[PDB]
Amino acid sequence: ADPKWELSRARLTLGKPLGEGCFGQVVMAEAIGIDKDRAAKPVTVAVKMLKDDATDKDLSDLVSEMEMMKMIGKHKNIINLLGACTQGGPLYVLVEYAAKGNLREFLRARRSGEEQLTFKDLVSCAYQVARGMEYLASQKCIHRDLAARNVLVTEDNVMKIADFGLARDVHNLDYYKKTTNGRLPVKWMAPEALFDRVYTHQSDVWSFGVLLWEIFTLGGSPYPGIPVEELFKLLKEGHRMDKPANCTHDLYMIMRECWHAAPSQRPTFKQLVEDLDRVLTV
Ligand SMILES: COc1cc2[nH]nc(-c3cnn(C)c3)c2cc1C(=O)Nc1c(C)cccc1C
Ligand SMILES: [Cl-]
Ligand SMILES: [Mg+2]
C-alpha cells in the first residue's frame, strides 16, 4: 500500500452503481476526509472496482490504471485519482464524481428540453476536452478511445476525460469490434491505428474530430447507415462525415483537419486549443 494515496475502507461508504464497462464497474460513494482541509467532511466520489467474475488479469489492469493515474498527475479537464483501498480486500480506486454524468447523455438530453445548449456552450465543451487532451499528450499519455461517452460533466459544467490511464493490453481489437455502452469503439479509431495496430497522439486527434462531430450533432452516432465491415475501405477512399446541421464553417474545418489521411497533417492538441480559443474569442 502506497501511504500517499491509501484511504481506510472505514472512510468509504459505497452507494448506487453509476455504470459498467469492459474496464470495470463504477459506483457512487461518500469518502470522509479525502479533502485534507477537513478530515471529517463527506465528499461524494466515484469508485472504480472489478466485477464479481473478474480475473487476475483484470485486477493487474486496474492496478496498472491506478499507477498510471499517479504518474500522469492532476488536471482540471481529466477525471482525477483521489485515493485507493489496496489492502484489506477488493481493489477500490477512488476518482472524481461528475454530477451531470457523461457528455454524450448530457448532449442527448438537451436536444429538446429547456436546458438548450448555445453555440458558445458547445464550443466551450470542445475547448475543455482539447485542454485535457493537450495535458495528457504533454505527459505522453495516449488515450486510445477518445469519445463523448468517455467524457464526464461536473455540476459546474467542467468537462473531464475518463479512462485515459488504461493499459494497451485491454485495447485489443475485440474491444473495438464489440458493442459497449451504446457504441462500437472502432468508429472513433484512426485508419492507420486499425491497420498498423499502434496508437499515437495523432490517432487521438482523429478520435477528437469524431468527438467534435458528436458535440455539434448533440450526441449523434458516427457514420450513420454505414456497415462497420465497409467503413475503413470508405475512409481509405476519402469518405468523411458531413457537416452537422447549423455547425459553422470554422468548426467543420477543425473536424476535417483532425481527419487528414496523413497523421503529420493533423493539428496537435496544442493547435486545437488555440483554434477553439479563436472561435470563442470571435
Ligand atoms: C471513470 O469513469 C467514470 C467516472 C465517473 N465519475 N462520476 C461519474 C458519474 C456518472 N454519473 N454521475 C452522476 C456521476 C462517473 C462515471 C464514469 C463512467 O461512466 N465510466 C465509464 C463506464 C462505467 C462505462 C464506459 C465508459 C466509461 C468512461
Ligand atoms: Cl457507434
Ligand atoms: Mg490551422
Q: Whose CA is nearest to atom 12 of ligand 1?
A: 101
Residues 22-39 as b or e (16 or more Cβ within 10 Å = b): bbbbbbebebbebeeeee
In the residue annotation, 121 being an active-site residue is answered as no
166 lines ligand 1 (CB under 6 A): no
- Name all domains of the chain by residue range, CATH numbers in brackets: 9-96 (3.30.200.20), 103-281 (1.10.510.10)
Determine which one of 145, 163, 204, 275 is catalytic: 145
The alpha carbon of 127 and the centre of ligand 2 are apart by a number of angstroms equal to: 23
21 lines ligand 1 (CB under 6 A): yes
Alpha-carbon gap, residue 206 to 189, rounded angstroms: 7
Alpha-carbon gap, residue 13 to 95, rounded angstroms: 14
Q: What 3 state SS string does 196-263 have?
A: HCCCCHHHHHHHHHHHHHHHHCCCCCCCCCCCHHHHHHHHHCCCCCCCCCCCCHHHHHHHHHHCCCCH
Give the resolution to one decimal, in Å. 1.6
For residue 107, report the phi and psi dihedrals to the nearest 5 degrees: -65, -45
Count Cα neighbours of 11 within 13 Å in the Cβ-side half-sphere: 23
Residues 196-234 as b or e (16 or more Cβ within 10 Å = b): eeebbbbbbbbbbbbbbbbbbbbbbebbeeeeeeebeee
20 lines ligand 1 (CB under 6 A): yes
Q: How was it solved?
A: X-ray
DSSP symbol at 118: P
From 23, 26, 45, 95, the mutation candidate for ligand 1 (largest count of ligand atoms within 8 A of CB) is: 26
Instruction: Tell me which ligand sits closest to the C-alpha of residue 78.
Output: 1
From 14, 16, 18, the mutation candidate for ligand 1 (largest count of ligand atoms within 8 A of CB) is: 18
Of 192, 158, 179, nearest to 260 (Cα)? 192
Residues at the binding site for ATP are: 18-26, 48
User: Is 190 within 8 Å of 206 (Cβ atoms)?
Assistant: yes
Alpha-carbon gap, residue 19 to 124, rounded angstroms: 26
